[PDB]
Amino acid sequence: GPGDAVRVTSSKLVTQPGTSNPKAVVSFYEDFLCPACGIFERGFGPTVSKLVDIGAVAADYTMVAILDSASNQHYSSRAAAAAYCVADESIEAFRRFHAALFSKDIQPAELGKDFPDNARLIELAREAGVVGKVPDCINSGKYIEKVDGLAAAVNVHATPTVRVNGTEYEWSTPAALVAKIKEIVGDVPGIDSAAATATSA
Amino acid sequence: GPGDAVRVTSSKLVTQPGTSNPKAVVSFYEDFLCPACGIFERGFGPTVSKLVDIGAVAADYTMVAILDSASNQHYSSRAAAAAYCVADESIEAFRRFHAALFSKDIQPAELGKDFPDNARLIELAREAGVVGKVPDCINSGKYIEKVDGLAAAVNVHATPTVRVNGTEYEWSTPAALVAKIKEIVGDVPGIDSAAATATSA
Ligand SMILES: [Cl-]
Ligand SMILES: [Cl-]
């Protein structure tokens, strides 16, 4: 994630003919402390993952830190920054690490007293499959200023915000997202499967 | 809503034999400013309404104000207090008013600049079907201290929190809630309908 957003794609990515541009880019703007983003990601994550796998979409994630403050031990910014650290090593590891932070067992309550510290974030990055420069990147706070400026850069102050090809998308169910994507990329292999299993989780 | 919770039931309420106690009480602990509660209510509301209509559950709502602050113009507490004002007049009006505040067109962004003032809340109460003592109840801040103390009283500091017969319920989809309720009250008229239409919204 170079680059304000971390882009997640598979080798099956369906592109616009005559280009290397994805036909459908779903943009997600999220805060790791936001309980609404937690609900969204736990509900939609598998379906988005499947849309990526079959090549139907590129999934771009911009981890903002709008909830960050001393009162939450800077969890919003440290987690977002950690995700960008992880993405530097491996896109696949970012995928697991991003899913991990929004999982019910890990995401901290917004107004609670306990939040993963930097050592815990590094440990979760390790579990996601990467070390490399992550521990230094996290401990040094390499991406703190970056993530703290992201909300202003993309004009997002409510999360999760989703766009489909740049246009605001009023999401509802994962099955409806599959339907929306199919209107753009068509009946590509795996999409009806993605729809049917989205209707059942 | 007497009473920490506003209880919503229909005349079809299935009760424990030898008692006037509902066989299934679903307890909801919510903050009107909480975006997660907005997502939950928009996704689950119709299904809960149907469970109430067919008599499968009593739905008890405790409107906490954990997000309240001057930075949001006290929207959390004023809205919760308004809902209790509305409930004093009519349970049906509370149902509509509660659904109205969580609707996508009305619920304010948590970190935004604009929030319904007391005049707007009174106007929404009117649209929900009631006047009576509501304008005075709201303008006087009759229930502000009450709602500001609710979170501590029920020990809830994360919303939405749901309990089924007093036991914490890790909610997922409205169809799963129907399944859970059916385990308690059985195959009462309308419940399979509620399940099937829950699987489709
Ligand atoms: Cl990779
Ligand atoms: Cl009534």
Residue numbers in the entry:
A (entry chain A), B (entry chain A): 56 to 256
The authors write:
Bacterial Disulfide bond forming (Dsb) proteins facilitate proper folding and disulfide bond formation of periplasmic and secreted proteins. The M. tuberculosis proteome contains another predicted membrane-tethered Dsb protein, Mt-DsbA, which is encoded by an essential gene. Interestingly, an exhaustive transposon mutagenesis study showed that the genes encoding Mt-VKOR and Mt-DsbA are essential for optimal Mtb growth, whereas Mt-DsbE and Mt-DsbF are not, implying that Mt-DsbA is an essential Mtb protein. However Mt-DsbA possesses disulfide bond isomerase activity as confirmed by its ability to catalyze the refolding of scrambled ribonuclease A (scRNaseA) whereas Mt-DsbE and Mt-DsbF do not. This study represents the structural and functional characterization of an essential Mtb Dsb protein, Mt-DsbA, and suggests that Mt-DsbA likely acts on a distinct protein substrate set as compared to Mt-DsbE and Mt-DsbF due to their functional differences.
In this study, we have determined the 1.9 Å-resolution structure of the soluble form of Mt-DsbA (residues 46–255). The structure of Mt-DsbA was solved to 1.9 Å resolution, with two molecules in the asymmetric unit, and the final model had an Rwork/Rfree (%) of 20.2/23.8. Within the asymmetric unit, residues 56–255 from monomer A and residues 49–255 from monomer B were built into the electron density map while the remaining N-terminal residues were presumed to be disordered as there was no observable density. Each Mt-DsbA monomer comprises two domains, a TRX domain (residues 56–82 and 129–255) and an inserted α-helical domain (residues 83–128), reminiscent of the overall fold of Ec-DsbA. The TRX domain contains the canonical CXXC motif and consists of a four-stranded mixed β-sheet (β1-4) decorated with four α-helices (α1 and α6-8). The α-helical domain inserted between β3 and α6 of the TRX domain comprises four α-helices (α2-5), and is stabilized by a structural disulfide bond between helices α2 and α5 (Cys140 and Cys192 with a Sγ - Sγ distance of 2.1 Å), despite 100 mM DTT in the crystallization condition. The CXXC active site cysteines, adopt a right-handed hook conformation at the N-terminal of helix α1 where the solvent exposed Cys89 and solvent buried Cys92 are reduced with a distance of 3.7 Å between the two Sγ atoms. The Mt-DsbA cis-Pro loop (Thr214-Pro215-Thr216), a conserved feature within the redox-active TRX family, interacts with the CXXC motif through Thr214, which hydrogen bonds to both Cys89 and Cys92. The electrostatic molecular surface representation of Mt-DsbA reveals a shallow hydrophobic pocket at the CXXC active site surrounded by negatively charged patches. To determine whether Mt-DsbA has isomerase activity, we tested Mt-DsbA catalyzed recovery of active RNaseA from oxidized, disulfide-scrambled RNaseA (scRNaseA).
